[PDB]
């Protein structure tokens, strides 16, 4: 159905059914499709960006990407397998609340911070994983990319369980953009950041199905 029937079946009609038959006539008469040619302007839809391509030479090889996407899966496989074991152990580690952006930022990078141990990540629920990725994106917007961050992002990703929420899809995109952008600043291939940025772009585009963003060489 798109238009279901609710009611049944030259001088005015005295009975309803006789009316509706009569109507059924007059409209069947009528042209189902009509087109009114006319003669003589638009609003804008702020669709977001994609990902900034790599400078010539820097974009990584499909084989490598493919290898990274493969291995990551094994990680994530292992991460899943032994979640329960690491769920139960934790000497220092005052794990901030899911609400505490500023406290979760210092926790991870500090102001130095805790790395992502399985003991520490395996306790964090999906909602926290999400939030923590976000703050770490926010700390990225406003600061230099560090390997603490890279491992932290990477690890948050490994724990990120799909099917992803559309919210989490969008967050990892915004992230990868920053990577691709922060990539434009590089002056030599031997830069620490380069490969790290490339990975995080890679895993998102290929592992997390966000292919429009991917590095094609």
């Amino acid at each position: 159905e798109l238009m279901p029937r609710l009611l049944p079946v030259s001088v005015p009609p005295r009975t309803p059914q006789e009316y509706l038959r009569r109507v059924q006539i007059e409209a069947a008469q009528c042209p189902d499709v009509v087109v009114a040619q006319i003669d003589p302007k638009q609003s804008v839809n702020i669709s977001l960006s994609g990902c900034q391509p790599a400078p010539e030479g820097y974009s990584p090889t499909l084989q490598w990407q493919q290898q990274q996407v493969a291995q990551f899966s094994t990680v994530r496989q292992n991460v899943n397998k032994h979640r329960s074991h690491w769920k139960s152990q934790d000497s220092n580690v005052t794990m901030p609340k899911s609400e505490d952006e500023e406290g979760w930022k210092k926790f991870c990078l500090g102001e130095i911070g805790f790395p992502p141990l399985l003991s520490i990540v395996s306790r964090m629920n999906q909602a926290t994983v999400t939030s923590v990725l976000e703050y770490l994106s926010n700390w990225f917007g406003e600061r230099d990319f560090t390997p603490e961050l890279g491992r932290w992002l990477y690890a948050l990703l490994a724990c990120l369980e799909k099917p992803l929420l559309p919210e989490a899809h969008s967050l990892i995109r915004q992230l990868a953009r920053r990577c691709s952008e922060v990539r434009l600043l590089v002056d030599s291939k031997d830069d620490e950041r380069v490969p790290a940025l490339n990975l995080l772009i890679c895993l998102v585009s290929r592992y997390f199905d966000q292919r429009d963003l991917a590095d094609e060489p």
């Binding site: 990584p60 490598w64 290898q67 990274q68 291995q71 990551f72 990680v75 292992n78 991460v79 690491w86 790395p115 992502p116 141990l117 399985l118 003991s119 990540v121 390997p147 890279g150 491992r151 990477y154 690890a155 490994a158 380069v194 490969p195 790290a196 490339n198 990975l199």
Partner: peptide
Amino acid sequence: DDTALIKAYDKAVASFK
């Protein structure tokens, strides 16, 4: 292996060449 996530990332980064 608790630092295993760290080593993976590390391994993964060091693969780029």
